[PDB]
Amino acid sequence: PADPKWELSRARLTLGKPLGEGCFGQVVMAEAIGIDKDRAAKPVTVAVKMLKDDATDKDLSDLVSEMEMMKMIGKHKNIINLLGACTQGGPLYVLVEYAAKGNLREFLRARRSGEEQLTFKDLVSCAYQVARGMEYLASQKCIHRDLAARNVLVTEDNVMKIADFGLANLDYYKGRLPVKWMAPEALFDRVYTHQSDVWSFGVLLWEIFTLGGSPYPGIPVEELFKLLKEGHRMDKPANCTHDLYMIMRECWHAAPSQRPTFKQLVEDLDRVLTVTSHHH
Ligand SMILES: *CCC(=O)N1C[C@@H](n2nc(C#Cc3cc4ncn(C5CC5)c4cc3Cl)c(C(N)=O)c2NC)C[C@@H]1COC
Numbered sequence: 001p002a003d004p005k006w007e008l009s010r011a012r013l014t015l016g017k018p019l020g021e022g023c024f025g026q027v028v029m030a031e032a033i034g035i036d037k038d039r040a041a042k043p044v045t046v047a048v049k050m051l052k053d054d055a056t057d058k059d060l061s062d063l064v065s066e067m068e069m070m071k072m073i074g075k076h077k078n079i080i081n082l083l084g085a086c087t088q089g090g091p092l093y094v095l096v097e098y099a100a101k102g103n104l105r106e107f108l109r110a111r112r113s114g115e116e117q118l119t120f121k122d123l124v125s126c127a128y129q130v131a132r133g134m135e136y137l138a139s140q141k142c143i144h145r146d147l148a149a150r151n152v153l154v155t156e157d158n159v160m161k162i163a164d165f166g167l168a169n170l171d172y173y174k175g176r177l178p179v180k181w182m183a184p185e186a187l188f189d190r191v192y193t194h195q196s197d198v199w200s201f202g203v204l205l206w207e208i209f210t211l212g213g214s215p216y217p218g219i220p221v222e223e224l225f226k227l228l229k230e231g232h233r234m235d236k237p238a239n240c241t242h243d244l245y246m247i248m249r250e251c252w253h254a255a256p257s258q259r260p261t262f263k264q265l266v267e268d269l270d271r272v273l274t275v276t277s278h279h280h
């Protein structure tokens with residue numbers, strides 16, 4: 001189906017090197033000229049998603065549905081945005097924003113030391129940006145279902161971009177279930193809400209302030225649910241302020257209705273940024 005407003009000429013795309021394997025599908029980096037049609041030949045580095053060589057008809061419909069979902073959700077500075085597609089005269093290419101610094105977990109773990117060592121204010125800024133992206137997704141009735149630092153990408157300009165949204169019988173056996181990021185009611189029922197996303201955001205906050213730590217260190221998966229239901233929660237990360245830990249703890253309220261909304265989390269993290277600039 002034709003959609004000129006999103007179509008890019010193949011002649012203006014130069015496909016480049018692949019970007020890793022098996023987590024966001026078959027992705028390659030590319031140079032695209034004239035994405036914005038009012039900017040003449042302005043060059044832009046992009047990430048391209050395409051089908052595998054042995055792809056089935058269902059795989060094509062899946063990628064087309066993912067593309068249509070990106071068109072419907074709309075644009076926001078803190079999500080991986082759709083820039084356009086090559087749908088005519090060749091294989092399907094879905095162009096999205098390129099994030100040079102990789103996923104947030106690896107970005108954090110590489111900046112624990114060295115000249116590019118992240119400051120406390122940089123970590124608060126990262127959390128604020130992810131909350132803004134999630135506030136946007138929730139406003140568009142989109143539940144992420146897998147919010148975690150591994151699913152946030154970082155641009156050359158350190159902009160946080162939520163990725164792995166859009167795409168999203170369990171009782172029969174045929175990426176494992178992300179149990180350590182799941183709200184107790186999500187673990188229990190295997191149902192997701194914006195409120196279970198807020199719990200996941202709390203775990204992501206803990207990932208940010210531990211600079212990529214692994215949640216619930218030392219807890220066997222068979223003990224996790226009982227402990228969370230009894231009120232067990234992760235301890236405050238070292239160097240983390242009491243206020244930020246209270247935000248994490250409110251994200252992890254046992255009652256989904258008592259957790260903050262993403263709109264409230266944006267406000268709370270904006271407050272923490274202000275108070276951080278005063279205690280230094
Ligand atoms: C998975 C990890 C891995 O291989 N790499 C490569 C590196 N990478 N991955 C992406 C991407 C992407 C992406 C994300 C989406 N979320 C939704 N959707 C559409 C609905 C289907 C997409 C599509 C794609 Cl292509 C990028 C990027 N976009 O720039 C990058 N850049 C390096 C991340 C990770 C390495 O991390 C250390």
Ligand SMILES: [Cl-]
Pocket residue numbers: 138194195260261262263
């Ligand atoms: Cl919300």
